[PDB]
Structures are given as C-alpha cells and as structure tokens.
Amino acid sequence: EPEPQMVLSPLTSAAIFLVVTIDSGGEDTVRDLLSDVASLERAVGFRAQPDGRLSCVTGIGSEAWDRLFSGARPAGLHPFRELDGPVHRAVATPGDLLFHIRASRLDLCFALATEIMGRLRGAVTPQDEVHGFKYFDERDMLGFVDGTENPTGAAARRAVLVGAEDPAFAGGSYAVVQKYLHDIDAWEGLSVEAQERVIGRRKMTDVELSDDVKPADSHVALTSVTGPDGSDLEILRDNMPFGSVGREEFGTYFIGYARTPEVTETMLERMFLGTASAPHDRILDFSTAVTGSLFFTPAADFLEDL
Amino acid sequence: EPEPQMVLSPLTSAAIFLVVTIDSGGEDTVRDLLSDVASLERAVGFRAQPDGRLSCVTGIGSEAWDRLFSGARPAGLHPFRELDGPVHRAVATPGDLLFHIRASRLDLCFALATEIMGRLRGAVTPQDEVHGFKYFDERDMLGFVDGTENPTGAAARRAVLVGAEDPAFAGGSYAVVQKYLHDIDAWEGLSVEAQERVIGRRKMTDVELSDDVKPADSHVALTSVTGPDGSDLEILRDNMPFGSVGREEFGTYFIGYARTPEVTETMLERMFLGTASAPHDRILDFSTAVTGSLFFTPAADFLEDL
Amino acid sequence: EPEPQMVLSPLTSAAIFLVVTIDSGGEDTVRDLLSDVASLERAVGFRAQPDGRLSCVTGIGSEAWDRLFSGARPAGLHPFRELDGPVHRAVATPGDLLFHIRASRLDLCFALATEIMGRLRGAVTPQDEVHGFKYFDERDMLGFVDGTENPTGAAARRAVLVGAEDPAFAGGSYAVVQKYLHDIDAWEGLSVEAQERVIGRRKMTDVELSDDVKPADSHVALTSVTGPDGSDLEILRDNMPFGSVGREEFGTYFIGYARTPEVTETMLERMFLGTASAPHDRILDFSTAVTGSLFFTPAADFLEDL
Amino acid sequence: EPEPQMVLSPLTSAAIFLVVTIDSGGEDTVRDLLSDVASLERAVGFRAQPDGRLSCVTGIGSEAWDRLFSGARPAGLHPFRELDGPVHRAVATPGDLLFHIRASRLDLCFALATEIMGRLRGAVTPQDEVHGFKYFDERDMLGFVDGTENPTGAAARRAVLVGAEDPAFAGGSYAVVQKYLHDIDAWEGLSVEAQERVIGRRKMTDVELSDDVKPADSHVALTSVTGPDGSDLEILRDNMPFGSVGREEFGTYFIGYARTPEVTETMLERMFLGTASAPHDRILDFSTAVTGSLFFTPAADFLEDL
Amino acid sequence: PEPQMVLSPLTSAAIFLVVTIDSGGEDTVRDLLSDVASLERAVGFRAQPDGRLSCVTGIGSEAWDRLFSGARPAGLHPFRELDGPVHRAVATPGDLLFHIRASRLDLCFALATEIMGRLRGAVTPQDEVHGFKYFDERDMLGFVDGTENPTGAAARRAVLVGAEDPAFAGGSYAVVQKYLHDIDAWEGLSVEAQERVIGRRKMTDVELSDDVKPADSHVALTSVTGPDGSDLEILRDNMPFGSVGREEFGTYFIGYARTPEVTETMLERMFLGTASAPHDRILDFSTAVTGSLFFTPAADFLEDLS
Amino acid sequence: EPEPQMVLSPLTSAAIFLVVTIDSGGEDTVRDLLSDVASLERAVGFRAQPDGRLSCVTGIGSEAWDRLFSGARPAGLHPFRELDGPVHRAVATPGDLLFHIRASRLDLCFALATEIMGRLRGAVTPQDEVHGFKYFDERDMLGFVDGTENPTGAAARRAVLVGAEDPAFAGGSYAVVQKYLHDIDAWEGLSVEAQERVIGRRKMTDVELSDDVKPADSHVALTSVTGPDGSDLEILRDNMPFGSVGREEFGTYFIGYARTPEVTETMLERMFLGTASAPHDRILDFSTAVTGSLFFTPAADFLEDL
Ligand code: HEM
Ligand code: HEM
Ligand code: HEM
Ligand code: HEM
C-alpha cells in the first residue's frame, strides 16, 4: 500500500547525484518521466542481478511541487533555508529534481542517468552532477570512516519514513543535499590527535572519543541531538567522496534523509550558527558548502500513479 | 502462518527442471520422497553456504493429486489446457511431478536431483530434464534481457501466493511449464529493429518501447493484461536458457508462478489465440512449445506433514 | 518491538569465542562496557561493509546476573548443570560473560575482541578463548558436515527467541557452550561406514541414514527429540572447528541457542545419560567436553538502556 | 617461436566438447573456419575479461588431415586404435574435428560453440557434444578428486608439446578423447575403503596410498609408467564430469594431451589389456568407454596461416 | 631491462592525467620521476592481491629536451596534427602523462593525489579523465572495444622497444586522444548501419566478413600490413568516460607501440583516408579534442634519475 | 635448471608456521616425509583450485642438515647467531625443520599441516606453531602497512635464490624466523607522529618519510643497506600478524628470505647493535623477539630426489 523508494538501502561503492531545474514549459515532460522512472531503473538494473544493487531515489523541491501537482503538499516541504552564521554560511542553491543513483558499479549508474536525462532533454537544465566513489574502508576525504552511526532496521524506518503525522504522504522522506569542498592542505597541517578532536572519533579505529574528552565543538558533539523524550534524533546519511586532483577538488557530497526536515535543519543550525557552548562545528573550518537544496522523495506508488 | 516453498526466490545462474510421471503402484514411494525433499535439499545445500543458494520447488499435477491424496484439492488445479490456435498450438504433455531446482552452481542442482531420482527409481518415468544456464546479462536465446518486469516485494507475494480464497492451501502456488525451441536461423535474419518490434523492448538497453510505437502483436503488448478492477495481472517467471549446438536446439524453458492459473492461462490465450487487434504473439513465429504442464506447488509444511 | 541481538544470524567463516569471569569489584566497569558493546560492534564493522558480516552476541551467566542487575531475572537462567554419566561427564566451568564474535574475516573479530578486552582490563579474568575457522564445506574435525538441520526462518525465531512466556525478557535467548576435544586417532581407525553409524548421516553426501539402519545410540537419534506435544524441539547451532596441530588439539566449539535451556539440557541428558535403548551418545566415545557454561543473551535494547 | 594453442591451460568450471565429421565437399568451409577460430575465440572471450578464461583447442583427426592439407603430416597422427581386451574394450568412433572449449561460465562456451557451428552448418555432421561441469572440490562422478598429479610448469611443457623430434609441427600436441559412462549403482555398493583400493588414493583427503598398501591393479598404479630413461611418462588430463539424471547417465569425459600418442596409448594398453601383475584396471569394472578418437592439435600459428 | 606496466590488461578504473611543466619546475619533476614507483608501491600494497594498481609515466618530446641532456629515443617527436578535408586530429600541450589503472577508482585517486601533491607549483594540469568499464568491455558507441589487442609474445614484439634502439630498450610510445561522441547522431543509425561503420557485429562482437566489410569501416582502415606482409599491431587501453548533464560521452584513446610510425600510419589512414576511403566513418561521430605523444621509458631509467 | 620451492610467491591471507625438532632416531621418518611433502601439498591444494593458493616451503636447520645428509653443505648454513646488544637481544631457539604454509584460507593450511604432522608423529617435537592472519590492508599489529618495499620480479629472484656462488645448492634460499611480541600499551602511548618517526613511513598512507625528516634510528633507515659495490641488499619478507586477546599477546611473525644469511644478519646487527649514528632500532623498544632460527630451504628437486 505505501511502498517507499529505496531511501533505506545501504551505501554502495558508486553513486551519481544529479540535480536539475525544470525549464518553463517542461512540466508535462517531467511528469511523464516521473511515471516511468521505476520502469527505467528495472530496465537497466535487471541486466546486473544479483550483484548490481542499482537504485534511484527521485526527489522534488518545494517550488517544483507547486508547478507539477495540485492538491495537498507534504507538510514539511519548503525551500532550503540559508544559514548565515557569524563565520560560516550554508548557501541555498537552485534545484527542482534530485536523482540519487546508487549501484555497486558506476556503469549501471551512468546508464540509468543517461536514460533519465535522455527523456528530459530540452525540458530541464542541469545544476549539479557528482560521481561519487567509495574510498578505502568507507572513508571520507578527511580520512575518517563516515556513516558509522547511521540507524538500521526499525530504527531507520522510524527516523526516515513519513508516517501517520502526514498520512497522504506516508512512505516518503525528506532529503537535504549539500556539496562540500575540503581544504586538504589545512587539514593535513593538523596532527592526527587534533583531527580526532575536530571529528570526535579516533581516526584509524573509528572508536568514539569518551564524553570527558570529546570537545563541545566537535562534529559528533554538535550533530548529536536529543528529542523531547531523551531519545536521539537520527538521520540516514549516504555521503560519498568525489573529486578532481588537477583542480584540487576534494569533496564530500552530503545527502541526509529524515522523516521531517526539522531534524536535519536543527543539526545544520547547530553546526553553522553554533550554541552557547560551541562557536560552530570545527569541521566547517576545513569544509565549505557550495550547494544546498531540500527535496521530498515520495513513496514509489505516488510516482507510479501519475 | 503457512510456510511457502521457495517460489518467491530470484533467478539463479543454474537450474535443473525435472518432470516425471508416477508409474502404477508408485504412489507410496513418491509420498515418502515428498516428505523428505526438504531434508534432502538441506543435506546438499548446507555444504555450499553461504553462496550456494540451492532451492527445490516441488509441484504436483492434477491427475497425480488424486492418486496421492484424499480430501481437499486446490481449487484451481486442473490439467493443462491445450490451445489449438489457427497457426500455433500450446500442447499438453504428461507430467505428474515437477522439481524446479535452482542454485548458483550446476553441481549442487545435479547432486540434489541425483538424490531425488535415486529415491524414485522404479516408481516414476522421466518425461523431461533440462539443464538451464544464465546467458550473459540475464538474456534469453533471442538475445533479449528476460525477467525485467517480474514483480518484487509485496507485489510478488500478492501475485504468486494462494491466500484466503483457498485457505486450506494458503502459501501454495501454481506453476505452468512449457519448453520452447527457437528458430534461431530465422530470428537472426531479422534486423534488430524488427526483433524489437516482435518483443516490445529495445534489445541492447532493455528499455520498453513507448506505447505509440509498440505493435499490438508484440509479446509485451499481448502479455500485459489488466484485471476487472483495472489492476495489472502479474506472474513470476523463472525462465532459463538451454540448448545443444549440435542438434540446433536453442531453447527457453518457461516457468511461471501465479496465485491462480487463470492469470497465466489468460496470457497464453492472448498469445496463442490472439485478440481483436492481433492474430497471435509474433514471438511464436520463432518459438515452438514442445511441452506443457500445470502443477500446484503446496506450502512447505503440507509436504512435511504427510 | 524488542530488537534481538544477532542470535539468528548464519554461520560465518571466522569466529572468536571469549569467556571471562568478573573479578571482585569489576561490576561497574562491566556495566559500562555492556552499554557500549553495540557501539563498538559498529565502530569496527562499518569499515568492512558490505561483506564483513561482523556481529557480536553478548551473554551473561546466572551468578553474574545477580551481581550486575537488580529486579527481574530471566526465568530459565541458572548455572550449567554438570551431568555425571557412568562413562562420560559434562563438566561445568566458570563463565560470567560470553562474547560470541563472528565475521567473514578473522581480523574484524580480533579487532572487536581487542576493543572489548581493552575496556575490561582489570575487571575480568579470561577463562577461554577460541579462534574458529570454517573447514572445507562446513565440515567439523570429524569430517562430517555440521549444522545441516538448523532451523531457518520462522521456525528459527520460534525455537530461539524468548516470547510472551517471559515478556520482560522477550527477544532474548539462552546459549550453552561446550569446548570439545576429539580423539582423531581413534576416530580415524574407524571405517567410514562405522563413522556413519556413530553420527547417523552419510559422510561425503550428508544424507541422513534411513530410520531402518540408523543406530539408536547415533548422535542424530539421540539429539532428535519431541515435546509431549509431539513437535520437534529445535536448537540453533553455531559450532566452529578449532585446533593446534602441534599439540594434537582437534576441536569442536559447541554453541547452541534456544528459547529455553530445558531443550538443550534434554539433549545433553540424552547424550551423556542415555535412554532405554542407548547407553550414551557414541560421538562422546571420540569427544571430550572440557568446558560447559550457560548464558542468557538479552535483547539488544536491554543492554543499550543500561 | 611457435605459439601453442591453450593445451597447457588449467581446468575450468565449465566445458563443451564437440566432435564432428566433415561431410562430402565440406573441406573449404572447414579450412576457412580453422583460419578464423582464434578470432572467434577473442570475439566472444573479450566480453568477459578478466575472469571469463574462455579458450578453444581445435584438433584434427588422421583421415581429416589428409583431406584438408597437402605436404607433411605430424609424425604420430593415426586413427585411434581400438583395444579389444579379454573383458573390457576401448572402442574407436568417428571424429574428424575436435573443439575443446573451456571457460569459467557455460554461457561463454556455448556462445563460442554456436559461432563455430554456425560457420560449419552444412559442412559437418555432429558426432558428440558434452557439456561438462565442475563437481564440488574438483571431484569426478566416482567421488574422487581428479586431476591432482597433472604436470605443471616446465614439466607440463615437456610432456605435452611437440618439439625438435618433429620440428615442422613444434608447438602442437596430441589429444585422445573417450566418453565414459559409470555404473554408479555398482560403485556405491563398494565400501569407501574398497573404492580407495580401486583408485589408489584416499577418497575424502586425496592423499595417495603408500606403496605398501596400493594394489597393483589400482588405477594410479597402472597409469604410472616409467620410460626407458627411468623417466616418468606424463600426460595432461582435462577430464570433466557430465550427466543426465533421468537417463541415469553419470559420466567422465576423458581428454588427455601428450607430446606423442604413444604415451597415452601405453597407458590405455595397461588399463584395458593389463600387465603381468594385473588383468586390467579395476576402474574399468565401473566405467564403460563409448567413444574413442585421436586428434592432433596444431600450433596456433599453423591454423592462422591458412 | 624492466619495462613499466605497458603490457598489463584493461582494468575497471583508470585516471589519465596530462600536465605541462612550468618554467623552473624541472628539478621538482625529475625528483618525482625518481620516486613514482615507490609511490605506486606505497598505495598499491595496501590492496594486494586484487587492487592491480599500476602507473605508467610518459614524457613528451619538448619535455625530454628540457629534462635530459643525453640521447633521445629515436621515435620521439611532437604529435603531428592531421588536417584532413573534413576531420582534423589536433595536437594539444602535454609534457607528462600518468596512466593510472586499478580495479577500483579509490586507488587510482590516492596515487594521483600523491603524484600531484609532489608536483604542485611545478606543473599545470592540462587534462584529467576518470575512466570506467562499461558493461561487457563496451565503449560509449555500444561496441566491445579492445578485442584484437595483441597478447603474450606478439604484444611484447609490438609494444616494447628493442635492439633497434638499444639505450631505450624496454620503453614504448603512447599516443593519447580524447574523443567526444555525437550520441544523438549515432543513435539515429540502425544497428546494421553502425556495424558497417565499425566493421563488427554489435551484440556479439564478431568481425564482418571481408565481402561485407566496407572499405571505410574503422576495422578496415586500422588494419595495416607492413612490407614484410605481417600485421602491424598496437595495444589499446581505451576507456569510456562522460558527464550526462553536459552531454559528454567520450572515449579516451591510448595506444602503445614500439615505434610511433605504426600508430601514426593508422591515424593518417583514418583522418586522411586512402584510395578507397575518404576517411574513417567513426570520425563522423567522434571528435578528437586532445592529441599528444609520449615516450614511456623502462622502469630502471626513471629509478636511475637525479 | 633447479626448480625452487615457492620462496618467491606473494603474501596470502592465512599462514601456518610450524617449527619442530627431530628426536633422536627420527631421521629416517623425516627423510621419507621430505621426499613426499610436494605430493602432500598437491593432494590437499588441488581441492581448492583455482583460488586456494596453497604452498609449503620446507626449511632445514644447520644441526639437522648434518644429521640428515652426508656430503657437501650449503655455504652459509649455520645456527642462528644470538645478538647480545646493550639493551636488546636476539635470542637463538631450537628448530630443526620449518614448514611455512600459506593459503587464501586457513582450512587448507591446517589440512596440510595435519598431514605433515601425521607423518612425523613420534619422530619430532613441536617447538612453535603460529597461525597468522591478514589484518586489514596488509597491516601489522603496530598499525603500519607491512611488506611494501619487498622486491618483485627479477630483483626478487636475484635477492633470494642461491646461484653460481654456491652452485651445488642453486635454487635454494635461506630463511630467518623470529617471533616478535609487541608492547602495545607502550606503543599506544606514542602519538601517531612519534610512531611514524619510529618506523620511517606515514601511518595511514604508507608513504615513506623524506630523507630529511626520516630519523637515523628509524626502522626503515636501519634496514636500508647498500653493499661495497653500491647495490642495495634486499630480502623478501612474508611477515604475518598473530595474537591472543585474553593473554594480551599481539605479535608479528617475522620470516625473511635471502640468498645468503649475511644480508639478513647485517640487517639484524644494525637493528640490535646499532651503528655510528643509531644506538639500536627504535622498533625494538616496542617489540621483543622470543624465538630465532635459521633454515636452508633447498631447491624442490633436492627434496624429491631423497
Ligand atoms: C563536511 C561534511 C561532512 C563530513 C566529512 C562528515 C563526517 C562525519 C564523520 C566522519 C562522522 C562520524 C562517523 C559517523 O557516525 O558517520 C559523522 C557523523 C555524523 N554526521 Fe557528519 N559529516 C559531514 C557533514 C554533516 C552534516 C551536514 C550533517 C547534518 C546535517 C552531518 C550529520 C552527522 C551525524 C548526525 C552524525 C552522527 C553523529 C552521532 O550520533 O555520533 N554531517 N560525520
Ligand atoms: C562433539 C561435539 C559435536 C559434534 C562434532 C557434533 C556434530 C554433529 C553433526 C555432524 C550433526 C549432523 C548434521 C547436522 O544436522 O548438524 C549434528 C547434529 C545435531 N547435533 Fe551435534 N555435534 C556435537 C555436539 C552436540 C551437542 C552437545 C548437542 C546438543 C546439546 C548437539 C545437538 C545436535 C542436534 C540437535 C543436531 C540435529 C539433529 C537432527 O535433528 O537431525 N550436538 N551434530
Ligand atoms: C573514437 C575513438 C575510437 C573508438 C570508439 C574505437 C573503437 C573500436 C572498436 C569498437 C574496435 C573493434 C574491436 C577491437 O578490436 O577493439 C576497434 C578496433 C581498432 N581500433 Fe579503434 N576506436 C577508436 C579510435 C582508434 C584510434 C585513434 C586508433 C588508432 C590510432 C584505433 C585503432 C584500432 C585498431 C588498431 C583496432 C583493431 C583493428 C583490427 O585489427 O581488427 N582506434 N576500435
Ligand atoms: C619487529 C617486528 C617487525 C615489524 C613489525 C616490521 C615492520 C616493518 C614495516 C612497517 C616496514 C615498512 C614497510 C615495508 O615493509 O617496506 C618495514 C620495512 C622493512 N623491514 Fe621490518 N619489521 C620488523 C622486523 C624486521 C626485521 C627483523 C628485519 C630484518 C632482519 C626487517 C627488515 C625490513 C626491511 C628490509 C624493510 C624494508 C626497508 C626499506 O628498504 O624500505 N624488519 N618493516
């Protein structure tokens, strides 16, 4: 009845992230593609069963939603909110549609992106394209294991999927994306122990620092948030490394899924604006966000029903 | 909760299909084998975990049911209905038991089949034995990706498993088998574009032709059927290639699972007898059915407790 | 609702079994460690996604429970009961905590064990440590496939997890461990046929001997038990081989999970004390138990909510 | 500098053996296929780099040689010699061309066999086609590890490749094929220890029996032959299991390569005709030859030069 | 003389880096060249045995004169621009080539990062391409690409400098060209028409017969026979690359040869044509946007530098 | 040409090191086993083709050589020379035979060791048995990638095989073994930067430290040796981690192969006794040798010919 898209699925060794804007007069072409995206994913993906693990998660931005559909909107859908901190800024950049494409091989991702874009040619303008790759033992460009504390099982379901709070849109999710570029030269000037105090975990072994030693402005400290009832508010991250050596571009493509954007936005506010105990997240002293967009990823049957 | 046999499990790289008839006075031997087939599957399969993926699905034909069992019969169980179209015919051939054996390796299939047939020696007569193999990127002998639109998840369960409409047999399914031989000489004389018009999908990329270009007598058009309620009727297919180059035998072994045989039967009727828009399915111009049988595959517990 | 530990997960190619006692005054250090074991499991295991398959099952013994926790006790928790047969004895040995660590590679097991033992230094005393390895096609040191008749799916859940009969501890299980050393010299003086009569299955093919020829004092005969309800009583076994060639140590590390210890204890009594028709299990003529301990493995959330 | 065909390559998981005779008028078609066979092998094989390991060895029989080529003949090429022993017979059957096709997957073998036979349609009559498969840990249908004592490295080159003794044909080899069908019922009536005596090695562990225990009519004893120079005479065997359970067809497809047919013929004589100390090879009491043919497999460059 | 890894096969990932040496950057580059093999080992050893990381370093003609004082490789000269009537092969700056391959992109990226870290401020990047395997060794035109590469001793003879230039024995010459394809134009051809452009069957990769193969097909024009009569061969490690948003669908051409004359002869035939052919038809769908020639010295040459 | 044992082959994921002494009177049994060790290796190893990678290198100590054999001895065969430094000592411990067993899986190593020791029972006394395992990305227990600068190709052959300097023993090698235990508590007290100064390489990335920063008492500095004629003296190391968590045993099993013990001894003297610039190798401040033995590993044909 409420079949979600593959928002709960694990990290893979390859990804493509595509973000586009819909041109004036391109809505009908988009709606037609949306109704077919599941068929296209199967068309390509079936060629590589059992090990291909191809998926595509399609998201739709707030303004786009109003152009495409009449009737109810998801309760939490709004444009990404720019955060202008005293030192660091989280920019909002244009994006109407997100395609988060994952597989165990880049070819599958590329083949599917080709089919999607082929259908949208002349109706959309590309805003961003990133080809992500796994880096060693699930490391990011800063050299730390990245994704460790993601929720799993029932916990992930509860953290990520819209439920009875917005019944018309149950099985959907909200995705926030941000493309970060790192200052690798600066970061490499820190000792490993200083890097560990920025993140909040040991570098090689990935063991969390004890509470008596973890700084209040470490990344793990600032992105740990408790809800009304003492429980952790969780998001599901599918961050991937990307880059270009000749351009000195060493990045993290951030994508986080959550059942309400309020959770992800709380984490961002703490990072960028800081708290009474932390000026800002120290990870931002080595990381610049160059995109920022929010999407709603509907249940799969919503897109079919078109 | 009734425990199904492995009728929902995916395609594998190797398969053995075995169809036998039960000789007069063979019933007791067969019943004792039926009660042991799961333990035989584990005895062989356990040797190859975790990657062996050995399974065996056992089906029983309509006439055999009546020789083996007193009491309730599955509601949809009848002999395969011969279809004598104007040009093409779907023959009915004898078969009392089906063993649908799958694994990631042929040795495991062969070892299990050996143990089964050793127990049935003198009680059964073999009618058909086919050793199927994966062909490139999930292709069939016509060079097309085959299996793409199979249901998955909840949809597959709904489509395949008997439920409350026949509660004594909940968790069962119906399998139809047909062995097809292809005229490869004739097929390979067609252009790719002509072959695509026969199937209804692009050959290399496996993308479905749009509705405005897809012929009414293409295979995909004829095997797409909407139910009374406008709901699509679905089957689960585990087709495998087979052949012998020296005898010019290039085959598709068709096996389709469904909650009721009426669904599969409607598809065959459309293919063999045609519609208002189509004389018959053009695939049949290059494919000849040489067997045809219908089996019920009971819930696993049913076999266990007999 | 309650999340079990990974007690239902399959065999892997590597394991570490670590049994320790809690030293006088070690209680608080152990409680802090128990609250963090899942975190540690993730810290190490995430590095090896997706194929590492690291898990850790943590068990607590009867005496230790009382030292660590106030309030309710699991209903079936008691010290391992020594069985002093006429010929063979099942010894009870000290053990307060069990860590059953599994992965597809030993390095992941060793890394996690290192992190747990580093946190427990000064608070526990090691009692046994075994590094298990897969031996050919899931064989044990006697040369027989080992694990074949383990329950799977729903039958496993039913057989292993505590439910509404003890609702405060639902999602838990009971583990019994015994380290066995084999007399391989004596074993290898037996013909294959004689070995088959000891075990109750064919050696190469792992097919069960038929009821006609299966000895009453065979291993499989004695460990096949039914309730007064008539159903099979099942346990889940994760036995691993281990050894040292220079010391002539050829071993089977037995670990069996069950929803109540009574099931496993019944099997042990049949083995060591025999039945009307069998003096004891013949496997014990070639196998000596040198440890014996019983643990409760709580639901995951019990440990966390510490 | 002559380039051999892939006669020194290892065993693979899948094989196809194809034997055909050349029809009246078929010689030109055959010579054109021979000139292209390496190019066909690449055409198919490159699709599955790095792991497909596709190869084709092409052999030519004695009578066919003379129909296809003028000028010199290989020194040792003659028709297979039938051996009519007092109990068992090594039969000779027709065969002009051999294709020995190997890969890690059957699809590659089948695709190459399809391209080959497509070229040859109307010029050849198929005599035999077998699809071989790996059986557990390099076992044959008798349950023994099969291939152990094959030569490797320098020793294999010396044993298999024609050298200065026949310089115009240096880089070639001689292949003897025999299809054997086994009496599995008779074989399984022997204890394992009796089977071990027949073969001359331990069944499970593959360790050779000591000289003190090994019978003179054991298979290993009879196929161990020393030359006049005290030199061990060696062949390279690529035999594969095959079968059909319904037909009770459990087979060994024997293929042995050697630098001269006299080595292989000596072994056959010892097996079928026996020695002073053994009437015949006991393996033949459970194994019946139903084909026998001898081929020369030229250097790769010889075929290309056509 | 130890060659660099120019004979090694295709891998699933590659990075191609081309840089120019800034005025005054010569000493830094010499230093790096002396260390490139130690960097390769430093990264590569981490992923033994399946990483397959390699780096081949090439030096252009102008750079050679700037870096070294002694003799020049006899064939070393700037890439020769070809201005054909319709199509042009452009010559673009490039002093150093790093051709980095592995089974995973992370290893490629890590090594590139270390190389470029050492060169920062001494070199200017000219081109960086991240190549990926596309299905069954296909290129962006949908054809299997690499089939007729030489192997074994033929590859060695075709690719490595020998006695004809003894001071440079073990070296090779690499030509690179980055090509972008007009996929829209290409996809408007029938498959049959595309086959006539290439000269091989699309799906099966079988060469067209010499009757059917057009004179202006790519295979016909790149098939070159020397005075001798024997085929002139090169070794190609072409990789796909692209960007879907930018409509960039590319083939990164790299071809290795013992003398540049061979590759240059093929280029002349393609762009300038022959008696029979105005130009290679593949160029109607393919534009070269880079063109550079490099000498890749023996490994000992680079190790022995100041 | 003498055929070496597998002394040049790469590191594997699993290893067993077995060191025994020969009891008085066990010489004949030992000689018989030495003549069979290659047959035993094949017997087990063939079961796991193609990926088992099982090998066994057999070494003989100086005192043992003189008990087993008569006639000429290898020129550099002597007992391990104890090194009594001011601070650190390298002990000499008994060992007459070494079996260095490697495979991709421990079961294969264990099965072969079982067969070898089965044959030697009652003739030998075990002295050491270590079961080594790969640790992450080729790391040792100190957390550094270990094996990076091993020689490969021709350089490896030159460094490790006896040649014309001792022609009767050409194709042999010398192995030195030392079992090291590490003081992990002390090591973990160092910053990563301080550990890098002890080793001489970067910890995560395995890049060698610059010659300006690399300390003179770093491990890499002291084990880098040039000969009188300017050549680098190299050894081939197949070190493996081992340990036991409950005993707080974290080790490195050192094994180095070289064509003369003089190279390995020179390295050891520099480490333990120091140089004009370094008191001793800083690695020894965290590593204690607990065994030390020297073996000659003869050419394979020497063993076979006994
Ligand atoms: C510059 C970009 C980023 C990098 C390189 C990065 C890296 C990391 C690393 C290494 C960890 C620790 C291991 C783990 O549990 O994944 C972590 C944890 C986490 N990150 Fe980030 N991160 C980035 C941006 C973000 C952003 C933008 C958010 C939220 C809006 C976020 C939310 C989190 C959360 C919730 C955790 C888990 C904290 C916990 O409960 O322990 N991260 N990240
Ligand atoms: C010496 C230690 C042991 C060895 C080497 C061993 C070996 C085996 C083998 C080879 C089988 C047959 C294949 C399979 O179903 O797993 C088996 C079955 C079994 N074993 Fe054991 N076992 C040992 C100890 C135990 C112990 C201590 C128990 C219980 C307390 C146990 C309970 C079982 C059960 C329940 C079965 C399945 C019987 C059936 O239902 O068919 N085993 N074991
Ligand atoms: C757009 C750029 C190119 C593409 C997509 C391309 C594609 C192909 C394909 C599909 C084949 C047939 C299969 C094979 O043998 O690899 C082929 C063959 C070949 N190509 Fe190209 N190629 C390109 C550029 C070049 C260039 C620039 C050269 C030489 C300077 C070249 C030399 C060859 C050679 C020598 C063969 C083998 C011909 C034979 O002996 O059958 N290619 N290429
Ligand atoms: C105590 C335990 C030992 C440890 C943990 C260890 C560890 C290491 C490490 C991490 C490296 C750097 C990476 C590489 O392998 O190239 C290295 C290099 C080396 N080690 Fe050791 N080692 C040990 C003992 C020894 C011994 C006893 C010797 C010689 C007798 C030795 C000889 C070498 C050599 C020759 C190199 C390469 C130096 C170079 O040319 O860069 N090691 N070792």
Numbering used by the authors:
A (entry chain D), B (entry chain B), C (entry chain C), D (entry chain E), F (entry chain A): 7 to 312
E (entry chain F): 8 to 313
Q: How is this structure described in the published paper?
A:
A widely applicable approach is the use of photocaged substrates, where the photocage is soaked into the crystal in advance and then activated using a laser pulse to provide uniform initiation of the reaction throughout the crystal. This work characterizes photocage release of nitric oxide and binding of this ligand to two heme protein systems, cytochrome c′-β and dye-decolourizing peroxidase B using a fixed target sample delivery system. In this work, we describe a thorough characterization of the application of the NO photocage N,N′-bis-(carb­oxy­methyl)-N,N′-di­nitroso-1,4-phenyl­enedi­amine (henceforth referred to as NO cage) to room-temperature microcrystals of two proteins: a gas binding cytochrome c′ (McCP-β) and a dye-decolourizing peroxidase B (DtpB). Laser parameters for photoactivation are systematically explored, and time-resolved structures over timescales ranging from 100 µs to 1.4 s using synchrotron and XFEL beamlines are described. We have demonstrated a sample and time efficient approach using fixed targets to carry out time-resolved SSX and SFX experiments with an NO photocage over the microsecond to second time regimes.
Comparison of these different structures revealed no significant changes in the binding geometry of NO or nearby residues in the heme pocket, meaning that only a two-state transition between unbound and bound states is observed. This suggests that any intermediate steps in the NO binding process must be complete on timescales of less than 100 µs. On binding to the heme, NO was observed to bind in an end-on fashion via the nitro­gen atom with an Fe—N distance of approximately 2.0–2.5 Å and an Fe—N—O angle of approximately 105–150°. The variability in these values occurs across the six independent heme groups within the crystallographic model and could represent either genuine differences in binding due to subtle differences in the crystalline environments or simply uncertainty in modelling a small ligand into the electron density features. A small shift in the side-chain position of Asn245 was observed compared with the ‘empty’ site structure in all six of the hemes, and at all laser powers and timepoints. For DtpB, the structure of the NO ferric heme complex of this or any other B-type DyP have not been previously determined, and thus we have demonstrated here that such a complex rapidly forms on exposure to NO after photocage release.
